[PDB]
Write an enzyme that holds these catalytic residues in place. Sequence first.
Site, PDB file in Angstrom:
ATOM      1  N   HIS A 154      11.075   8.483   4.883  1.00  9.16           N
ATOM      2  CA  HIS A 154       9.787   8.323   5.562  1.00  9.16           C
ATOM      3  C   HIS A 154       8.888   9.525   5.276  1.00  9.16           C
ATOM      4  CE1 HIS A 154       7.402   6.927   9.261  1.00  9.16           C
ATOM      5  NE2 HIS A 154       6.987   8.175   9.129  1.00  9.16           N
ATOM      6  N   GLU A 155       9.452  10.729   5.343  1.00 13.09           N
ATOM      7  CA  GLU A 155       8.664  11.940   5.119  1.00 13.09           C
ATOM      8  C   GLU A 155       8.204  12.061   3.673  1.00 13.09           C
ATOM      9  OE1 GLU A 155       7.430  13.217   7.466  1.00 13.09           O
ATOM     10  OE2 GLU A 155       8.792  12.596   9.061  1.00 13.09           O
ATOM     11  N   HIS A 209       1.698   4.645  14.987  1.00 13.68           N
ATOM     12  CA  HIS A 209       3.129   4.365  15.094  1.00 13.68           C
ATOM     13  C   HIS A 209       3.429   3.095  15.872  1.00 13.68           C
ATOM     14  CE1 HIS A 209       3.053   8.782  14.363  1.00 13.68           C
ATOM     15  NE2 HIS A 209       4.092   8.496  13.600  1.00 13.68           N
ATOM     16  N   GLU A 252       1.755   4.694   8.107  1.00 18.26           N
ATOM     17  CA  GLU A 252       3.042   4.688   8.801  1.00 18.26           C
ATOM     18  C   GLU A 252       3.971   3.599   8.284  1.00 18.26           C
ATOM     19  OE1 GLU A 252       4.962   6.290  11.082  1.00 18.26           O
ATOM     20  OE2 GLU A 252       3.621   7.852  10.250  1.00 18.26           O
ATOM     21  N   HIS A 311       5.367   9.846   2.958  1.00 21.31           N
ATOM     22  CA  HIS A 311       4.051  10.328   3.369  1.00 21.31           C
ATOM     23  C   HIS A 311       3.401  11.134   2.250  1.00 21.31           C
ATOM     24  CE1 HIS A 311       3.383   8.977   7.423  1.00 21.31           C
ATOM     25  NE2 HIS A 311       4.421   9.604   7.950  1.00 21.31           N
ATOM     26  N   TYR A 344      -5.248   8.993   8.455  1.00 19.09           N
ATOM     27  CA  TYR A 344      -4.215   8.853   9.489  1.00 19.09           C
ATOM     28  C   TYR A 344      -4.797   8.497  10.860  1.00 19.09           C
ATOM     29  CZ  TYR A 344       0.584   9.592  11.138  1.00 19.09           C
ATOM     30  OH  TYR A 344       1.859   9.461  11.634  1.00 19.09           O
ATOM     31  N   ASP A 398      -2.147   8.164  20.048  1.00 14.55           N
ATOM     32  CA  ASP A 398      -1.381   8.064  18.806  1.00 14.55           C
ATOM     33  C   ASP A 398      -2.302   7.788  17.617  1.00 14.55           C
ATOM     34  OD1 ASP A 398       0.957   7.886  17.102  1.00 14.55           O
ATOM     35  OD2 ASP A 398       1.015   5.734  17.472  1.00 14.55           O
TER      36      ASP A 398
END
Length: 316
Positions: free
Chosen positions: A142-143, A231, A166, A146, A157, A226
Amino acid sequence: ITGTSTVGVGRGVLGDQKNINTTYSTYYYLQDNTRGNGIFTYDAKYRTTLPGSLWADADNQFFASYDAPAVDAHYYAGVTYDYYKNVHNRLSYDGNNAAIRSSVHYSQGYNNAFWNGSQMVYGDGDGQTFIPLSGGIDVVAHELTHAVTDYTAGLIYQNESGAINEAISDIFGTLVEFYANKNPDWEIGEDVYTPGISGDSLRSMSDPAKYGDPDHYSKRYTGTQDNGGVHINSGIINKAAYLISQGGTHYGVSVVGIGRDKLGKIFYRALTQYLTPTSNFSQLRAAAVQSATDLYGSTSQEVASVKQAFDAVGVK
Ligand SMILES: CC(C)C[C@H](NC(=O)CNP(=O)(O)[C@@H](Cc1ccccc1)NC(=O)OCc1ccccc1)C(=O)O
Ligand SMILES: [Ca+2]
Ligand SMILES: [Ca+2]
Ligand SMILES: [Ca+2]
Ligand SMILES: [Ca+2]
Ligand SMILES: [Zn+2]
């Protein structure tokens, strides 16, 4: 650092033994020279000053409890590098073999992980909500995803573009988890979330509503928390991706699944050739349709299934 490539051994967060690529020069450093221009793992030492110090070890053995988050951040960055290179012919996150940097032991009791514009960062968790977050291959991927997004589509974002950002990270986090083929699933973060509760996760792609997230555009979050629900509304796209791969009938709309590999090809092409920083969900649908058309033809099942999946989640 300048040195010679070595192979250490250690245990990760979940107690599994693995070999790790290191570099020897007085100490053994978490520096893997076998991939691109290197993968480098740092100790943030419970502080918030980044990156911290390049991880140094006297004996090339990484079996201490304190070592475990570093072992996994380093190893799973390598797996994710391999996925992008072998599956998509992409060399690191910038496509030109940029060095990959991660810091572990970030802050105290830190229940999260992130890409800060320049590197990956992992908390240790508080031991109740999370254990050290690099223990999850889907988290690590996931990281790094990004970073891929930031260097390609550049999705801003917030709001719908941020929810796509996301979802792209959850999708490729999951595809990397399947690539490594250890307990793969369509759940997000299950390996490091809530050590006292079995069978849960932070998000579900197969049933986002299990953890409160929308599975249809009519249930999207429209408030300001958020970053406008990045998310939360990711669930709508995660569900569409799950349906493209696995099939199903959702709110009465049937989707013929085409499998994970074709999902990955379609979404990788959409991300890198069609999406822009402000793409919304409707524009993602169009990008995915066009990507499937490029790869498989306008009359293909793959195109038809992309349309069915976005129909099923209410995205036109
Ligand atoms: C820079 C950051 C301080 C701000 C921001 N990132 C985030 O807010 C979270 N980092 P992340 O998106 O990489 C994912 C990592 C992850 C953890 C467990 C499982 C799988 C992945 N965290 C995540 O999903 O948590 C849920 C959540 C966060 C915040 C609000 C609501 C829910 C940024 O990327 O700008
Ligand atoms: Ca040691
Ligand atoms: Ca799993
Ligand atoms: Ca998972
Ligand atoms: Ca749990
Ligand atoms: Zn994220």
